[PDB]
Amino acid sequence: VTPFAQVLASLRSVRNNFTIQKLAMETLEELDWALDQLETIQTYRSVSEMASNKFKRMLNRELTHLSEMSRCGNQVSEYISNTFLDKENEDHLAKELEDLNKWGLNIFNVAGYSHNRPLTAIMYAIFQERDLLKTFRISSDTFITYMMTLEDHYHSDVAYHNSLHAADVAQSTHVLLSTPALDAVFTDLEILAAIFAAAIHDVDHPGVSNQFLINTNSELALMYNDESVLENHHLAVGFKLLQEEHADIFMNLTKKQRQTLRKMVIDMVLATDMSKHMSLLADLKTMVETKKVTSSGVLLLDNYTDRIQVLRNMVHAADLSNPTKSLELYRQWTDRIMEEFFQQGDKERERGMEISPMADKHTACVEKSQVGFIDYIVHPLWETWADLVQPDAQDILDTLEDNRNWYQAMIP
Amino acid sequence: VTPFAQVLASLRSVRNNFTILTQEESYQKLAMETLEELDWALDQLETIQTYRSVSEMASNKFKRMLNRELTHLSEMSRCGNQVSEYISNTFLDKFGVNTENEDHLAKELEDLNKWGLNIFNVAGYSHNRPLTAIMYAIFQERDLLKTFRISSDTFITYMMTLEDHYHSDVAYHNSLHAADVAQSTHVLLSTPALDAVFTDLEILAAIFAAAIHDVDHPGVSNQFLINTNSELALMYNDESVLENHHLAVGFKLLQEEHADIFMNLTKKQRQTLRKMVIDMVLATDMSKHMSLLADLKTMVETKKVTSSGVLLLDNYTDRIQVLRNMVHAADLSNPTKSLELYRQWTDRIMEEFFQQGDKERERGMEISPMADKHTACVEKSQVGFIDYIVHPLWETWADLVQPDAQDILDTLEDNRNWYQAMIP
Numbered sequence: 001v002t003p004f005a006q007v008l009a010s011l012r013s014v015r016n017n018f019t020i021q022k023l024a025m026e027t028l029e030e031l032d033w034a035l036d037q038l039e040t041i042q043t044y045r046s047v048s049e050m051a052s053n054k055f056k057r058m059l060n061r062e063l064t065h066l067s068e069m070s071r072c073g074n075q076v077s078e079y080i081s082n083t084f085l086d087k088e089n090e091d092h093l094a095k096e097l098e099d100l101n102k103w104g105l106n107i108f109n110v111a112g113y114s115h116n117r118p119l120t121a122i123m124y125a126i127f128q129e130r131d132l133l134k135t136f137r138i139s140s141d142t143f144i145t146y147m148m149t150l151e152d153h154y155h156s157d158v159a160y161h162n163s164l165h166a167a168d169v170a171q172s173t174h175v176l177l178s179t180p181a182l183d184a185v186f187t188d189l190e191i192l193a194a195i196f197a198a199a200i201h202d203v204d205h206p207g208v209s210n211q212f213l214i215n216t217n218s219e220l221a222l223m224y225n226d227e228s229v230l231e232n233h234h235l236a237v238g239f240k241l242l243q244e245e246h247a248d249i250f251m252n253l254t255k256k257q258r259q260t261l262r263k264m265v266i267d268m269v270l271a272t273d274m275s276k277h278m279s280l281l282a283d284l285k286t287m288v289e290t291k292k293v294t295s296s297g298v299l300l301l302d303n304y305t306d307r308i309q310v311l312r313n314m315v316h317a318a319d320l321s322n323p324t325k326s327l328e329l330y331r332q333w334t335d336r337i338m339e340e341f342f343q344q345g346d347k348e349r350e351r352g353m354e355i356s357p358m359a360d361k362h363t364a365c366v367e368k369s370q371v372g373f374i375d376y377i378v379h380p381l382w383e384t385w386a387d388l389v390q391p392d393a394q395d396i397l398d399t400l401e402d403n404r405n406w407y408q409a410m411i412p
Numbered sequence: 413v414t415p416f417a418q419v420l421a422s423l424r425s426v427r428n429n430f431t432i433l434t435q436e437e438s439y440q441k442l443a444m445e446t447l448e449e450l451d452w453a454l455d456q457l458e459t460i461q462t463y464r465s466v467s468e469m470a471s472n473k474f475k476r477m478l479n480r481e482l483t484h485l486s487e488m489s490r491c492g493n494q495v496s497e498y499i500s501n502t503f504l505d506k507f508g509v510n511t512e513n514e515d516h517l518a519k520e521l522e523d524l525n526k527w528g529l530n531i532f533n534v535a536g537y538s539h540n541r542p543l544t545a546i547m548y549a550i551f552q553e554r555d556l557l558k559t560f561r562i563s564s565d566t567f568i569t570y571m572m573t574l575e576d577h578y579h580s581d582v583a584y585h586n587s588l589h590a591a592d593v594a595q596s597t598h599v600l601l602s603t604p605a606l607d608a609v610f611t612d613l614e615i616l617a618a619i620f621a622a623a624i625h626d627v628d629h630p631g632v633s634n635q636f637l638i639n640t641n642s643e644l645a646l647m648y649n650d651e652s653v654l655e656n657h658h659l660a661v662g663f664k665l666l667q668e669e670h671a672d673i674f675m676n677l678t679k680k681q682r683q684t685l686r687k688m689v690i691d692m693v694l695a696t697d698m699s700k701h702m703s704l705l706a707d708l709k710t711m712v713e714t715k716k717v718t719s720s721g722v723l724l725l726d727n728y729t730d731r732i733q734v735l736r737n738m739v740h741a742a743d744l745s746n747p748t749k750s751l752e753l754y755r756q757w758t759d760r761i762m763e764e765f766f767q768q769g770d771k772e773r774e775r776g777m778e779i780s781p782m783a784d785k786h787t788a789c790v791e792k793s794q795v796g797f798i799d800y801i802v803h804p805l806w807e808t809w810a811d812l813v814q815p816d817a818q819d820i821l822d823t824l825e826d827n828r829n830w831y832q833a834m835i836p
């Protein structure tokens with residue numbers, strides 16, 4: 001018997017026997033509401049995971065016993081467990097880099113003073129600031145060789161999803177990791193993973209959505225079976241570039257550390273798929289409801305699952321941070337976002353495809369879109385993040401509200 | 413506010429008020445037994461939950477709430493409508509030859525619709541092309557070439573390349589295993605309890621998923637591919653490495669000259685078939701076994717049957733849960749076949765495991781359990797495999813399609829007892 005069917009059947013008999021005055025009637029009303037909500041709020045996969053997890057632990061018990069029997073009983077248990085169970089200019093650059101630890105550092109100026117290499121410049125600054133090159137025994141040459149190839153694999157002719165956007169997300173993730181409420185929560189390995197996930201999260205982006213890649217029967221959609229097409233590709237390129245000569249920035253980690261980092265990075269870059277937004281928000285919201293905070297204001301994250309839920313939300317929030325930056329920065333990101341949408345619209349036109357809603361200058365409502373994006377996606381996410389790390393993130397939330405009102409006032 | 417927490421708090425309130433509200437010996441016994449039952453139900457509700465099951469309830473609620481807002485916004489202006497379309501699409505998730513071998517082939521193919529077909533003989537009488545031979549027989553039997561306007565040339569061009577992309581030098585995961593799974597799926601689709609339940613497109617999808625489910629298999633596990641830092645593991649981010657690859661090859665082969673067997677389907681039919689096939693082949697990942705078992709078990713518990721009484725599967729979700737379990741059961745059908753067939757499959761799976769062990773030895777890796785040809789406990793493994801995986805799955809399938817599959821279950825038990833009796 002499946003666990004959810006068992007619980008519902010016993011809750012139905014409790015209700016049937018409860019029926020067998022104001023207090024009695026008001027409670028039957030509350031029971032009937034909760035029992036109905038229990039059923040309706042369930043999906044096919046939520047019901048499934050309760051049952052599969054139960055079945056997995058039932059088999060895990062039966063094999064632990066079998067393992068104790070003989071050397072044969074042990075290899076049979078190992079086979080079954082592994083198969084059927086789961087798991088000059090440099091002066092100007094130095095001046096800009098003084099804002100490294102600040103929200104809204106001008107990354108556009110960093111690009112201008114680094115010969116249009118903001119990703120290499122910002123990643124090297126972050127790694128030195130955080131002492132990651134010493135901690136993880138990364139030679140400067142290894143770091144710069146990797147970063148330069150990584151930057152080279154970001155498309156220059158794509159207006160938004162280029163190395164300047166990656167530099168911005170990596171820098172924003174670096175600032176978010178420094179949140180006082182999150183002091184001493186993450187290991188050096190988790191910090192390394194988050195900044196690296198942020199730097200590679202859009203590498204080799206063609207400047208077109210996953211839906212465009214699916215609809216055009218692209219090699220990428222074919223290879224990845226229409227699931228997180230781009231996000232899977234960003235990871236494959238990111239990890240492949242480590243195999244280039246003198247570029248293995250993870251060469252001096254232990255085998256266990258590389259296994260752990262790889263798992264965390266995959267997890268974080270897959271969470272940047274925009275269609276997974278509501279799942280991340282639901283995870284972040286449950287974390288806020290059950291949050292355990294210190295007297296000094298520091299968050300308590302006991303286990304790996306809690307830490308990765310926060311980290312995957314951090315990289316996603318960093319990816320959706322343009323509306324939280326000063327208006328001057330935000331307006332420049334919106335121009336780039338729009339330019340890239342229009343560029344996808346051009347590719348749709350050359351293919352005879354139906355032009356996407358925001359993909360055409362004649363019909364795109366730029367200001368209303370920014371207001372919708374903030375109201376429906378950016379503000380609910382950042383408000384949940386701000387609740388988790390209170391009072392840190394209030395300035396972020398204040399900047400967001402100003403920018404929202406500015407865009408609202410700019411609607412024609 | 414997350415919904416599960418809200419429900420939990422509500423049921424906790426009901427319980428704390430039930431205690432206030434509670435000859436009369438029978439009343440007290442009823443009052444106490446129901447409180448203990450409620451407490452057990454509440455404890456089990458919390459414990460039986462996971463991080464992903466709870467969050468799933470919340471994300472689905474958030475998705476529905478936003479969809480409601482966006483539907484209203486789309487009615488406001490042409491601008492509101494394109495803003496709602498942007499947000500919805502981005503942030504939400506939705507001739508023939510006369511030969512002795514040909515006469516022998518026609519004789520074997522008389523058992524096409526039977527669980528008792530010998531695929532080893534089909535391979536021998538078809539120039540070691542069991543996949544093309546069996547798929548062509550299935551497609552003609554079911555009239556799929558006429559229904560979906562597939563010319564024989566296109567069909568045979570595709571099937572031949574598909575068969576060519578199965579490795580000959582791999583003992584188990586070759587075209588003979590694919591032919592076996594496709595034929596077993598064809599038989600399972602014909603179960604009387606599942607009569608007129610599936611559309612022609614769903615039938616096409618299941619047989620196609622079964623035929624392509626192991627294409628280009630290197631004869632090594634996903635764990636071997638992850639541990640050796642293979643290109644495949646790198647490409648697929650260590651998740652269902654092989655299963656993703658089987659699908660990519662299977663769909664890529666349609667692009668070969670005059671091999672597009674889906675060329676005359678509508679765009680909507682190709683979209684639906686593609687979705688179903690991906691779903692079915694990803695479900696063949698053995699590490700997903702307990703999820704499929706869980707889904708099949710819930711389906712048995714809530715099963716509705718007509719006057720006939722043929723199974724009733726109202727929506728698509730129910731239909732795909734059965735179909736992915738069917739292809740998985742077909743993939744785990746070797747122990748349910750006659751002993752003569754089963755013993756030949758066991759030799760092949762062992763030979764493949766040992767070939768992997770040789771690769772681990774040459775690489776200086778620790779030899780995987782079952783991969784050492786010198787230490788493998790072949791019989792005990794077959795007993796464990798049946799007791800823990802094959803029998804629980806087939807027993808659940810038999811409950812769903814009762815009384816059909818009783819013979820499948822009887823054989824499984826005989827083969828298990830035979831292997832048990834053969835333990836040295």
Ligand SMILES: [Mg+2]
Nearest residue numbers: 201202272273
């Ligand atoms: Mg992205």
Ligand SMILES: [Mg+2]
Nearest residue numbers: 625626696697
């Ligand atoms: Mg397989």
Ligand code: NA
Nearest residue numbers: 152154155156
């Ligand atoms: Na470039």
Ligand code: NA
Nearest residue numbers: 576578579580
């Ligand atoms: Na071959």
Ligand SMILES: [Zn+2]
Nearest residue numbers: 141145245246
């Ligand atoms: Zn060098």
Ligand SMILES: [Zn+2]
Nearest residue numbers: 169201202319
């Ligand atoms: Zn991004």
Ligand SMILES: [Zn+2]
Nearest residue numbers: 593625626743
């Ligand atoms: Zn198979």
